[PDB]
Amino acid sequence: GCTPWPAEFAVRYREAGYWTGETFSDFVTDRTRRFADRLAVVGAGQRWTYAELGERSAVLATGLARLGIAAGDRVVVQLPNIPELFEVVFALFRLGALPVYALPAHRAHEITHLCTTAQAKALIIPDRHAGFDYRTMAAQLRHAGTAPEHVVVVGEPGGFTPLAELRADRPDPGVFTRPEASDAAFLQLSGGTTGLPKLIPRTHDDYLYSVRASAEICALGTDTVYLAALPAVHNFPMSSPGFLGTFHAGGTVVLAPNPSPDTAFSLIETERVTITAVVPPIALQWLDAVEHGSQSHRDLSSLRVLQVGGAKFAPEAARRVRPVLGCTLQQVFGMAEGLVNYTRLDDPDDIITTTQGRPISPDDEIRIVDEADRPVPDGEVGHLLTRGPYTIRGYYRAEEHNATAFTPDGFYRTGDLVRRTPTGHLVVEGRAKDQINRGGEKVSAEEVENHILAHPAVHDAAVVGMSDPYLGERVCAYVIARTEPPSRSELLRFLRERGLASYKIPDRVEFVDRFPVTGVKISRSELRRELARRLD
């Protein structure tokens, strides 16, 4: 159900040296041997060398094989920032199995979609995290007939398979499999726009290219200490350059259990972090904690680069990074579908603070077009289209959607409005896709509406983004009741019971007799645009 690059593009990318032929199977073996004695992972009271990570993943892989996981099987991995994540991911790569990455904030609705769409053989979860019981969630899927036949729990297993069961056998490399580098190595979730998010297949060759190139752009080496402040399996903290870039270069990955200034600054001080990645709301929290007193004492001198991305970072805030934190800002504008843009570490400050970077690859093609696919004069704002050696050509098993998201000649419609500077940098100026960006977490208005409409007291609903100085947008729901409106508390509870991801629950509920817009003779997309203007 994947879409391949055209043969003439694949040839171009291999001859250019982007696509090298290495697989993640090769990657695990080579990097853990090349850097064996160095420190690879710090988290949860654990300190693992590359050698130990190699040994642990080889044991795990043997136990997953004994469980029934074979080459090509999809396995949904929904783990917090704990060291078990990396040994689980490396193990799956050793078997030639495909991780299917879910984030900790995802819930029954999203996990059901991933398991059924990917036909997953297993689900790997923690017992509890941030007050949520993932064992109960897995049990709900089992009750509905939608759960993978294997459920593995990190922690107290309940009635499922404890992770420790997978460690019972000595390593057996006879069960490992090396896939083809052109094959999909894993699946990840898109941001989502009109409903259920599409699955994104990424290949060994194209993803490892973005990892290698990102490690070079970001000056990574064995002296790198990368703090995973964001959920590590998101594309940004996984590959831009993320923990894979760090592993590629032989550095240390430090896991932050949460991104609070107290927790993160304590790790930066203790472990001497040199680079980390955050979304704008976290960057603002860190800046405020240091500048306005709460954390001014912390020793952040080891921090060289603060990456900020996933959502728009205002120039005003960006200008605070070096004066307040003492480090170089790097803006990162990327997407799970491919294209990643970076400001360069030796760009002038005016470029670093006012742009969202330029693409990784010389073969990243950038088209900025008007509403009729005509290129806009250089400097003007238009729709961003892109094509390149690590941008996909189609979503996983999304035949009808792919016909709309990609041009006939293979350009991906990002849904972003951008303008290009003379030096190739891009400035993100708006959005055309129907998607609310809540401080880096993407919310589909139509998806939230559909669940709201399922409540028996609701007659109609419209979900829009309301401008917010810290998150960019919050999620506001306009609701028209049939007669008496439900309890705002009640409606939000009904949405949690539905299984919506935590960040998709609206911040604001406004019950109205009618939508406060003229000509309610307009499409639902235009309706949301007019409602959002009242809130901006």
Ligand X SMILES: Nc1ncnc2c1ncn2[C@@H]1O[C@H](COP(=O)(O)O)[C@@H](O)[C@H]1O
| Residue ranges in contact with ligand X by CB under 6 A | 191, 235-236, 309-312, 331-336, 356, 414, 416, 428, 431, 437, 442
Q: How far is the CB of 276 from ligand X (least distance, A)?
A: 15
Q: How far is the CB of 489 from ligand X (least distance, A)?
A: 30
Q: How far is the CB of 231 from ligand X (least distance, A)?
A: 11
Burial class (CB in 10 A: 0-12, 13-18, 19+), 68: exposed
Q: Which two tokens stand for residue 322?
A: 């070096």
User: Do residues 201 and 231 lie in contact, with contact meaning Cβ atoms separated by under 8 Å?
Assistant: no
Q: Does 416 appear as a known binding residue? A: yes
Q: How far is the CB of 74 from ligand X (least distance, A)?
A: 20
Whole-number Å distance between alpha carbons of 321 and 325: 5
Taking the least distance from each CB to ligand X, the nearer of 32 and 437 is: 437
Whole-number Å distance between alpha carbons of 349 and 112: 45
Taking the least distance from each CB to ligand X, the nearer of 35 and 101 is: 101
User: Do residues 103 and 234 lie in contact, with contact meaning Cβ atoms separated by under 8 Å?
Assistant: yes
User: Cis link prior to 241 (omega < 30° from 0)?
Assistant: yes
Q: How far is the CB of 347 from ligand X (least distance, A)?
A: 15
Q: Could you report how far apart the first and last alpha carbons of the chain are, in Å?
A: 41
Taking the least distance from each CB to ligand X, the nearer of 224 and 356 is: 356
Q: Which positions ≥6 away from 132 have C-beta within 8 Å?
A: 104, 107
Q: Does 504 appear as a known binding residue? A: no
Whole-number Å distance between alpha carbons of 17 and 361: 11
Q: Does 75 appear as a known binding residue? A: no
Taking the least distance from each CB to ligand X, the nearer of 353 and 356 is: 356
Q: How far is the CB of 309 from ligand X (least distance, A)?
A: 4
Pairing between strand 365-369 and 382-387? Answer: antiparallel
- Helix ranges, 454-499 (H): 488-498
Whole-number Å distance between alpha carbons of 461 and 489: 16
Burial class (CB in 10 A: 0-12, 13-18, 19+), 156: exposed
Q: Does 305 appear as a known binding residue? A: no
Pairing between strand 132-133 and 128-129? Answer: antiparallel
Taking the least distance from each CB to ligand X, the nearer of 117 and 437 is: 437
Q: Write the single-letter amino acid at 466.
A: M
Q: Does 310 appear as a known binding residue? A: yes
Q: Which two tokens stand for residue 8?
A: 């003439």
Q: Which helix (H) or strand (E) holds 525?
A: helix 524-534
CA-nearest of 332, 329, 327 to 235 is 332
Q: How far is the CB of 432 from ligand X (least distance, A)?
A: 10
User: Do residues 367 and 339 lie in contact, with contact meaning Cβ atoms separated by under 8 Å?
Assistant: no
Q: How far is the CB of 131 from ligand X (least distance, A)?
A: 24
Taking the least distance from each CB to ligand X, the nearer of 93 and 333 is: 333
Taking the least distance from each CB to ligand X, the nearer of 56 and 425 is: 425
Q: Does 219 appear as a known binding residue? A: no
Q: Does 382 appear as a known binding residue? A: no
Q: Does 234 appear as a known binding residue? A: yes
Taking the least distance from each CB to ligand X, the nearer of 314 and 522 is: 314
The annotation places the binding site at: 234, 310, 332, 334, 336, 416, 433, 442
The annotation places the binding site for AMP at: 234, 310, 332, 334, 336, 416, 433, 442
